[PDB]
Structure 1
Amino acid sequence: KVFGRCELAAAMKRHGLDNYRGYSLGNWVCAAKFESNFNTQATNRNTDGSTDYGILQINSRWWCNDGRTPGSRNLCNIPCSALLSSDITASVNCAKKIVSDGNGMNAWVAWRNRCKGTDVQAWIRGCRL
């Protein structure tokens, strides 16, 4: 599913991501924009052989099981395929664990490089939330 901008903001809020660990909704929408362009089915293969999955490009080295990342963990206790669903519940619940891991949203390199320090409120501007 490719979400609309406000549609995704609303879904993220419904799932308790808004201001989670102090990160406003615009931060999460911005991260999703640059990680997946709001596409739940996004996948990308990393140089180390791990894969990133879903709207927030969650990585199989630590967070989910895909059966093809040697030496990896599955800390969210989910198949990576769950992160591709039109229902963002699994992605949100896993993101909550990731952002609580110590480095906040810096865990998403694209958030650090493209969202951090910017006017992230622009991502939820106009949205009925």
Structure 2
Amino acid sequence: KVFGRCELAAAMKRHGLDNYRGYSLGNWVCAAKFESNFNTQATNRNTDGSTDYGILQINSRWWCNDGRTPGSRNLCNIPCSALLSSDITASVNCAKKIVSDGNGMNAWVAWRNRCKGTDVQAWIRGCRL
């Protein structure tokens, strides 16, 4: 599922992401656009052998399990394929544990390079919230 802009912001707000760890809603929506372009089935291979999954591109080296990343951890205790569902519930709960891992939102290289320091509020433009 390729979410709509204001459609995805509503589902993230319902799942408790707005101001989660002090990060406004426009930040999370900004990170989605620049990690997966709002597409739930996005996948990208990394150079070290791991793979990013889902609407916020969660890495298999540490968080989920794909059975093909040797020496990996499964911190979110889920199959990485669960991060590709039309329901972002699994991706939201796993990202809550990522942003709480010390470095904050910096764990998403796209957010730090394309969202951090910008007018993130412009991403919830005209959304019925």
Q: TM-score, normalised by structure 1?
A: 0.99
Distance 2:38 2:65 in 1: 22
CA shift, 1:117, in A, is: 0.3
Distance, in Å, in 2 between the alignment partners of 1:105 and 1:74 is 20
Aligned Cα RMSD in Å? 0.3
In the alignment, the residues of structure 1 paired with residue 107 and residue 5 of structure 2 have an alpha-carbon distance, to the nearest angstrom, of 22
Compute the displacement of 1:115 (Å): 0.2
1:125 Cα offset (Å): 1.3
User: What percentage of aligned pairs have identical amino acids?
Assistant: 100
SS at match of 2:47: coil
Are residue 30 (structure 1) and residue 10 (structure 2) matched?
A: no
Distance (whole Å) between structure 1 residues aligned to residue 72 and residue 110 of structure 2:
22
- SS of the residue corresponding to residue 18 of structure 2 reads coil
SS across alignment from 1:96: helix
SS at match of 1:30: helix
Distance 1:69 1:123 in 2: 34
So what's the TM-score if we normalise by structure 2?
Answer: 0.99
Query: Which sections of structure 2, spanning at least 5 residues, go unmatched?
Result: none
Q: Does residue 114 of the first structure (1) align with residue 114 of the second (2)?
A: yes
Please list every run of at least 4 consecutive aligned residues from structure 1 whose deviation after the TM superposition is greater than 6 angstroms. Answer: none
Q: Could you list the runs of 5+ residues in structure 1 that have no partner in the other structure?
A: none
Tell me the distance in 2 between the aligned counterparts of 1:84 and 1:17. Answer: 18
Paired residues, number: 129
Distance in 1 (CA, whole Å) between partners of 2:52 and 2:20 is 22
Aligned residue for 2:44, secondary structure, equals: strand
User: What is the CA distance between 1:27 and its match in structure 2?
Assistant: 0.3
Partners of 2:45 and 2:98 in 1: CA distance: 19
Distance in 2, Cα, partners of 1:23 & 1:69: 30
Deviation at 1:72, TM superposition (A): 0.6
